[PDB]
From a paper:
A 1.6 Å X-ray crystal structure of dnHEM1 reveals excellent agreement to the design model with key features programmed as intended. To aid with structure determination, the surface of the protein was desymmetrized by introducing two mutations K29W and K165Y. The heme cofactor is positioned as designed but adopts a flipped conformation, which alters the relative positioning of the heme vinyl and methyl substituents, but preserves the positioning of the heme propionates. Similar flipped heme orientations have previously been observed in natural and engineered heme proteins. The propionate groups interact with a network of polar residues (K15, S46, N50, R190). The heme iron is coordinated by His148 as designed, which in turn forms a hydrogen bond with the backbone carbonyl oxygen of Ile144. The open coordination site is occupied by an exogenous imidazole in the dnHEM1 crystal structure. Overall, the crystal structure shows that we were successful in achieving our design goals; the heme is held in place by numerous polar and hydrophobic side chain–cofactor interactions, and the heme iron is coordinated on one side by a designed histidine and, on the other, by a small molecule from a solution that occupies a central binding cavity. Arg43 in the distal pocket of dnHEM1 sits in a similar position, relative to the heme cofactor, to a conserved catalytic arginine found in natural peroxidases. The crystal structure of dnHEM1 demonstrates the attainment of our design goal: the creation of high-affinity heme-binding proteins with an open coordination site adjacent to a large reconfigurable substrate binding cavity.
Here, with the goal of combining the advantages of the P450 catalytic site geometry with the almost unlimited customizability of de novo protein design, we design a high-affinity heme-binding protein, dnHEM1, with an axial histidine ligand, a vacant coordination site for generating reactive intermediates, and a tunable distal pocket for substrate binding. We chose closed α helical solenoid repeat architectures as optimal structural solutions to the general porphyrin-based protein catalyst design challenge. These hyperstable proteins have large central cavities lined by side chains emanating from repeating structural units; the stability and structure of the fold are determined by hydrophobic packing interactions within the repeat units, and hence, the cavity lining residues are almost entirely reconfigurable. We sought to incorporate a heme-binding site within the central cavity of the toroid, with a proximal histidine ligand directly coordinating the iron atom of the cofactor, the distal site open for catalysis, and sufficient non-polar and hydrogen bonding side chain–cofactor interactions at the base and edges of the binding pocket to hold the heme in place without obstructing the free coordination site or interfering with potential substrate binding.
Residue numbers in the entry: 1 to 211
The structure:
Amino acid sequence: VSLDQAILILVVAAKLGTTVEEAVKRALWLKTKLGVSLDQALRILSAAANTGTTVEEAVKRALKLKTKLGVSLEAALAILSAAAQLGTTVEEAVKRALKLKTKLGVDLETAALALLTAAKLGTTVEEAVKRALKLKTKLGVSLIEALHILLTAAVLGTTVEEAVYRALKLKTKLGVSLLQAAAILILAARLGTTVEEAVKRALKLKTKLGG
Ligand code: HEM
């Protein structure tokens, strides 16, 4: 596994409340039974947690949405997640996502990520997008990267500026990417532990899984 995948396995284990070995085995099971990538399997597990449904129910609803709309599995899972976080129906979340996709000129997955991030941050999606675009221009990151920083703030419970501070510090101290730094910070929060412990666990899992 890559460092990204190792971190995400641990995040989704924490989100589902399973053991780490159980998360790994669920991800490989989804790969085999559905023919999806590891990343897609992890997105399925994450969306199951985001929506409070069983993995089976999340897959059923995602495949239905993906087919009805003709969108990516990734986009469908993000929309399901946004609907649950917003406390609304899938149809309502789709309407919001299509509006945003049109206004910004982004793809549906990005729009859904923005809706999810804003709901978790406790802000309107216009305010979240404004802050993300400020990060994009000032830091030279992508919109997707900026939204993950907002998501980090949302999970950690800090201002965006503070999440930026912490992620850039980790980036420089560890030589990781910005997305890796965000994800480690999220992991440490979801584990109730130090960043040092989170990093240690990600590296040990990666070694246990082959390096
Ligand atoms: C650049 C392309 C990427 C895209 C389009 C993308 C998309 C997404 C989307 C749609 C979500 C929300 C869905 C969910 O909660 O299940 C998400 C959440 C997240 N992503 Fe990404 N992502 C990308 C890269 C990465 C990378 C490289 C990492 C790690 C190194 C990462 C780590 C995370 C984490 C930790 C979450 C939050 C999970 C949680 O709730 O704790 N993402 N991403």
